[PDB]
């Protein structure tokens, strides 16, 4: 059913909407990604491999910050990313402003889906050709959840997305454990990373983030560095 | 007044913070503040 | 294009004369600054001459430290025309031979299979050059 | 084919070939050339008269943009006429918003970006004309600029727009513009236009000339009818 | 496969954006090439200046544009395209100004430029730009930055980048440089940028057909060398 | 071929195919004429009965006292354009209280037909008009085409069949300037009739006259009141 592949607005007579699934192998063939929800908090761990040295590194990062205790990761599209990052934070604010305590997490995960389901209700708009993973930490508990070009939100324990994601989800069930430690969930997103990373780890090859209860913290390249010296 | 005006204005710059990921500086905070005010003719 | 042929004519010999003397430094200088005038002019003909006139006095007055520098400078030098450079290491090539003194023919022999390295216009001279350093 | 439809489509090797088209639909019009002398601008256009019922000075292709500023419009003539009420109303929008007659550079960019944006959009065309805009003054010196339906532009020193724009810049290149005033400017361009104008080709045609210098005081205006005359009497004496 | 490539809005079966991608090899149609270097405390841009007639003003023939008095810009592709990326960049410059107090950093100019891009990506209203936009400044605490916008919105800091038609081979010219640990003065990066460029292209660079833009941290103002500094430049790379 | 659907495609030759279908869109309409003397302008038009007994459509439209036109093309699209002129004209004579110059008045319907040439939602306006008016600067016969392109015309034909009146004015383009109003609508009326084919000729229940004068508004001549222009017509050679 070749001919309902180009518009957002028309079932398939199997009725599926072709194009998000597109959007969908769009995420797939992005950047292998994992995030992972320890008792501790979340970790979300991406592989920010530049084509060659002369990229600046250091320049942009995947990991981002939403508020000072929700981070958000991404793989799929790059620009469409910054957008993303772009409304979560506003979403952010502007729910701080009405209700002055910090966006939980599952709110800011609802909000994100909807807009992302926004640009999915129209022809002439193309859906966000990226899958966030989300952590947060509110009331003692992490959060993580994968927001979707289809508004679809889940509620991941543990996964990946991006290149070799089945790679990644087959590596976790094995190594995840839901009492583990946020250092133990920090050595098992990096190894997942390594099983579908092709090189050296360099510290300024992998960003990891942390959501534990002080909040969201983008690891400085040292302690990447450390963590990877501590796992090779 | 200076409730809400001042807490708008602290968002705005949490979130110039973050696109920026560097301290804001005082003169961001005294313009928008300004602008904002400007707008409202003395009315906040 | 602007050529300096009948000026380089009557140029060449009197400062030969004077680079015969010995001093040389000004008879190499009013060269240059003509080889810089005939290279930006493309005057293909008057820069080998001039570079052929230089490497001559060099050899004569046999300043081998000077000449090898000169040597140096003129292949180095920006956009130097192909033809004149291998006139000049033609030159320079002759001149090897009659050279006794071990380490001058050593030192010269290098610095010409170093300017001439990787160049096609000369991949011939390079050769010889590489095969009397064999030889020695 | 496929990826030619709209301007807002991308060819696979990369280009738009909606403003292609209307490159080379420029280039089926008759040949304007402008030359800036020493201290002005001088535009000539060959005007193919279709019929002989139309008046003379009908479908004028000189068109004044401002009290200084001059267009030699050659391509669709409605497309020109209405980059002409364009860029009339973005001078009258600078004189009337800064105070002081636009400047030519400015203008000219200006001009441009509304020329390109219609070359972005599925629901606009790109405009079917190129133009010159000319200009003198006693602080800016002469300038003169052209824009294609791309909207790329740039100052030239001489240039031709229409069919034989290769033709004329044959002939335009042969000239030390950087001395001469367009006193004498104005002939030579007149001389070049009756050389590149085909006879056999477009039948007859009327010559039109204009300029903007030092010696217009600075205003763009079109020549009189006697220096008009006497470039046409030394054009046709270089019949050998 | 390739019946996905007329609407910028449509997601091949292959999840890839066909449009965008006929944007970037209409890059390629300028057909000129400009490198940038960032020095240890200096930013250099280098572009061609290919001007195929004597009637052209060649003051005018310029593809160096200056957004901001300390944030100069090279563009490589479509000329209007270019301009027009040129303006929105200046008047994004001149918002961030009024609206903030302090001059923009580099960053965000490329940051916004690109989020624009992506915008006219998402949004199947406007033709995305085809020209790729090299922003150079020197940003305080962080010395010099150079930063390269494409047409769909990717934004990325470089060590020295390059864009138009031989943008590989300058950039692996440019990996095989940045390696070898050097000391990066201004003198030095300028002679990175043009031996980069007389590399690729095999010209003797004669002063009028290259551009060359200069920002350094003793003086952060966006400065375009005059054809005497670069005589100058290529005469000392020569020797 | 596929560039023939859009007014919005170019054609890989350069044109516009709409364009020129706009402009076909033209000869549908009956031949119709204007001419000016020194003096006076005059345009007079072919109506077409589409049945025996049904009245002849209307050619000629007022515009203003000064300014009246010659429609041929599209009926919808001539009415349209007319009331537009109309607004124009009223809102120059509310404005300055001086009536609006021809020329003024044609580069705004140039402007104005030019929009749906460039812009996707709206045929170009298919309809030629002759506009004879007078103003300060004499005289005045312009001629709008679908292009948007406007001619200022000594003596200009448009509509079907409508050559042979080029060719005639073309040949007798010399004499105009030195004629009287009588001369000159007698001129027209032959120009017009060269048009008709041979069985056919002039009457006057299908003939429109219209005169702008020096000291005359722009009066149209219907029906009877074509008969003192008609009368003393050299009859067509056969």
């Given at each position: 059913e070749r001919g309902y592949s180009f518009s957002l607005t028309t079932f398939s007579p199997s009725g599926k909407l072709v194009q998000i699934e597109y959007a969908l192998a769009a995420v797939a063939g992005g950047a292998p990604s994992v995030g992972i929800k320890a008792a501790n908090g979340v970790v979300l761990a991406t592989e920010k491999k530049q084509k060659s040295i002369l990229y600046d590194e250091r320049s942009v990062h995947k990991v981002?910050?939403?508020?000072?205790?929700?981070?958000?990761?991404?793989?799929?599209?790059?620009?469409?990313?910054?957008?993303?990052?772009?409304?979560?934070?506003?979403?952010?604010?502007?729910?701080?402003?009405?209700?002055?305590?910090?966006?939980?997490?599952?709110?800011?995960?609802?909000?994100?889906?909807?807009?992302?389901?926004?640009?999915?209700?129209?022809?002439?708009?193309?859906?966000?050709?990226?899958?966030?993973?989300?952590?947060?930490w509110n009331e003692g508990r992490p959060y993580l959840f994968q927001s979707d070009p289809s508004g679809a939100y889940f509620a991941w324990k543990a996964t990946a997305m991006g290149k070799?994601?089945?790679?990644?989800?087959?590596?976790?069930?094995?190594?995840?454990?839901?009492?583990?430690?946020?250092?133990?969930?920090?050595?098992?997103?990096?190894?997942?990373?390594?099983?579908?990373?092709?090189?050296?780890?360099?510290?300024?090859?992998?960003?990891?983030?942390?959501?534990?209860?002080?909040?969201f913290r983008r690891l400085t390249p040292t302690e990447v560095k450390d963590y990877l010296a501590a796992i090779a | 007044d200076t409730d809400m005006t001042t807490q708008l204005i602290s968002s705005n710059l949490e979130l110039h913070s973050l696109s920026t990921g560097r301290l804001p500086r005082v003169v961001t905070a005294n313009r928008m503040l300004k602008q904002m005010l400007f707008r409202y003719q003395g009315y906040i | 294009e602007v050529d300096y042929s009948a000026t380089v004519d009557q140029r060449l010999p009197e400062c030969a004369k004077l680079a015969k003397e010995g001093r040389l430094q000004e008879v190499i200088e009013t060269l240059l600054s003509l080889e810089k005038q005939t290279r930006t002019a493309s005057d293909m003909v008057s820069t080998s001459r001039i570079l052929v006139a230089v490497v001559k006095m060099c050899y004569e007055a046999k300043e081998w430290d000077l000449l090898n520098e000169n040597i140096?400078?003129?292949?180095?030098?920006?956009?130097?025309?192909?033809?004149?450079?291998?006139?000049m290491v033609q030159q320079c090539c002759t001149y090897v031979e009659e050279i006794t003194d071990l380490p001058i023919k050593l030192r010269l022999i290098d610095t010409l299979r170093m300017v001439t390295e990787g160049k096609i216009y000369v991949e011939i001279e390079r050769a010889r050059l590489t095969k009397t350093l064999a030889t020695i | 084919t496929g990826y030619d439809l709209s301007a807002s489509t991308f060819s696979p090797d990369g280009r738009v070939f909606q403003v292609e088209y209307a490159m080379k639909a420029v280039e089926n019009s008759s040949t304007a050339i402008g030359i800036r002398c020493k201290?002005?601008?001088?535009?000539?256009?060959?005007?193919?008269?279709?019929?002989?019922?139309?008046?003379?000075?009908?479908?004028?292709?000189?068109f004044n943009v401002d009290r200084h500023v001059g267009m030699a419009v050659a391509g669709l003539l409605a497309d020109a006429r209405s980059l002409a009420d364009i860029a009339r109303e973005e001078a009258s929008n600078f004189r009337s918003n800064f105070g002081y007659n636009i400047p030519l550079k400015h203008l000219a960019d200006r001009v441009a970006?509304?020329?390109?944006?219609?070359?972005?959009?599925?629901?606009?065309?790109?405009?079917?004309?190129?133009?010159?805009?000319?200009?003198?003054?006693?602080?800016?010196?002469?300038?003169?600029?052209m824009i294609d339906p791309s909207g790329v532009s740039y100052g030239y020193w001489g240039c031709a727009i229409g069919k034989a724009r290769q033709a004329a810049k044959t002939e335009i290149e042969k000239l030390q513009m950087k001395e001469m005033t367009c006193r004498d400017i104005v002939k030579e361009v007149a001389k070049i236009i009756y050389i590149v104008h085909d006879e056999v080709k477009d039948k007859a045609f009327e010559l039109e000339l204009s300029w903007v210098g030092e010696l217009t005081n600075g205003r763009h205006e079109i020549v009189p009818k006697d220096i008009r005359e006497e470039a046409e009497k030394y054009a046709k004496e270089s019949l050998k | 496969s390739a019946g996905f490539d007329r609407h910028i809005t449509i997601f091949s079966p292959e999840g890839r954006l066909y449009q965008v991608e006929y944007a970037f090899k209409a890059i390629n149609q300028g057909g000129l090439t400009s490198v940038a270097v960032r020095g240890k405390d200096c930013?250099?841009?280098?572009?061609?200046?290919?001007?195929?007639?004597?009637?052209?003003?060649?003051?005018?023939?310029?593809?160096?544009?200056?957004?901001?008095?300390?944030?100069?810009?090279?563009?490589?592709?479509?000329?209007?395209?270019?301009?027009?990326?040129?303006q929105r960049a200046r008047y994004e410059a001149a918002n961030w100004k009024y609206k903030y107090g302090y001059e923009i950093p580099v960053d965000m100019l490329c940051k916004r430029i690109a989020d624009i891009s992506q915008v006219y990506t998402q949004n199947a209203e406007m033709r995305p730009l085809g020209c790729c936009m090299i922003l150079i400044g020197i940003d305080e605490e962080q010395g010099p930055q150079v930063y390269k916008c494409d047409p769909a919105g990717y934004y990325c800091g470089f060590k020295a980048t390059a864009a138009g038609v031989k943008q590989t081979e300058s950039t692996s010219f440019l990996e095989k440089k940045v390696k070898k640990k050097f000391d990066w003065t201004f003198e030095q990066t300028v002679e990175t940028a043009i031996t980069c460029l007389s590399t690729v292209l095999s010209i003797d660079f004669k002063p009028s057909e290259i551009e060359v833009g200069v920002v350094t941290v003793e003086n952060p103002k966006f400065r375009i060398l005059t054809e005497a500094e670069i005589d100058a430049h290529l005469v000392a790379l020569a020797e | 071929?596929?560039?023939?659907?859009?007014?919005?495609?170019?054609?890989?030759?350069?044109?516009?195919?709409?364009?020129?279908?706009?402009?076909?869109?033209?000869?549908?309409?009956?031949?119709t004429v204007g001419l000016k003397s020194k003096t006076h302008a005059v345009l007079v038009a072919l109506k077409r009965a589409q049945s025996e007994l049904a009245a002849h459509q209307k050619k000629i439209l007022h515009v203003d006292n000064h300014i009246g036109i010659s429609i041929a093309g599209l009926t919808a699209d001539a009415r349209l354009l007319c009331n537009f002129m109309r607004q124009e004209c009223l809102d120059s004579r509310f404005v300055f209280d001086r009536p609006l110059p021809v020329s003024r008045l044609v580069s705004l319907i140039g402007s104005k037909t030019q929009i749906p040439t460039q812009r996707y939602g709206?045929?170009?306006?298919?309809?030629?008009?002759?506009?004879?008016?007078?103003?300060?600067?004499?005289?005045?016969?312009?001629?709008?085409?679908?292009?948007?392109?406007?001619?200022?015309?000594?003596?200009?034909?448009?509509?079907?069949?409508?050559?042979?009146?080029?060719?005639?004015?073309?040949?007798?383009?010399?004499?105009?300037?030195?004629?009287?109003?009588?001369?000159?609508?007698?001129?027209?009326?032959?120009?017009?009739?060269?048009?008709?084919?041979?069985?056919?000729?002039?009457?006057?229940?299908?003939?429109?006259?219209?005169?702008?004068?020096?000291?005359?508004?722009?009066?149209?001549?219907?029906?009877?009141?074509?008969?003192?222009?008609?009368?003393?017509?050299?009859?067509?050679?056969?």
């Open positions: 981002e910050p939403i508020t000072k205790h929700i981070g958000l990761v991404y793989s799929g599209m790059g620009p469409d990313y910054r957008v993303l990052v772009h409304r979560a934070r506003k979403l952010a604010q502007q729910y701080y402003l009405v209700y002055q305590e910090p966006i939980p997490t599952a709110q800011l995960v609802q909000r994100v889906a909807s807009v992302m389901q926004e640009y999915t209700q129209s022809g002439g708009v193309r859906p966000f050709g990226v899958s966030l993973l989300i952590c947060g070799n994601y089945v790679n990644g989800k087959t590596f976790l069930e094995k190594r995840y454990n839901e009492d583990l430690e946020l250092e133990d969930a920090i050595h098992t997103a990096i190894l997942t990373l390594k099983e579908s990373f092709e090189g050296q780890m360099t510290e300024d090859n992998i960003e990891v983030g942390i959501c534990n209860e002080a909040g | - | 140096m400078l003129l292949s180095k030098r920006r956009s130097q025309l192909k033809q004149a450079v291998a006139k | 201290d002005g601008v001088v535009f000539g256009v060959e005007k193919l008269v279709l019929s002989k019922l139309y008046e003379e000075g009908s479908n004028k292709r000189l970006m509304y020329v390109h944006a219609y070359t972005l959009y599925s629901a606009v065309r790109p405009f079917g004309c190129s133009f010159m805009l000319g200009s003198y003054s006693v602080n800016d010196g002469a300038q003169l600029y | 930013a250099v841009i280098v572009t061609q200046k290919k001007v195929p007639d004597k009637l052209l003003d060649s003051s005018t023939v310029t593809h160096l544009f200056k957004i901001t008095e300390n944030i100069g810009c090279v563009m490589t592709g479509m000329t209007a395209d270019s301009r027009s990326q040129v | 071929n596929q560039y023939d659907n859009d007014v919005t495609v170019w054609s890989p030759q350069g044109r516009i195919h709409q364009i020129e279908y706009a402009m076909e869109a033209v000869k549908q309409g009956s031949a709206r045929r170009p306006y298919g309809v030629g008009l002759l506009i004879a008016g007078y103003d300060d600067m004499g005289p005045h016969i312009f001629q709008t085409c679908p292009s948007a392109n406007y001619f200022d015309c000594r003596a200009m034909s448009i509509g079907a069949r409508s050559q042979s009146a080029r060719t005639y004015l073309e040949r007798h383009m010399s004499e105009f300037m030195e004629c009287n109003l009588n001369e000159l609508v007698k001129h027209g009326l032959r120009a017009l009739r060269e048009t008709l084919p041979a069985e056919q000729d002039l009457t006057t229940k299908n003939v429109s006259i219209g005169i702008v004068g020096k000291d005359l508004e722009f009066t149209i001549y219907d029906d009877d009141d074509v008969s003192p222009f008609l009368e003393g017509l050299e009859e067509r050679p056969q």
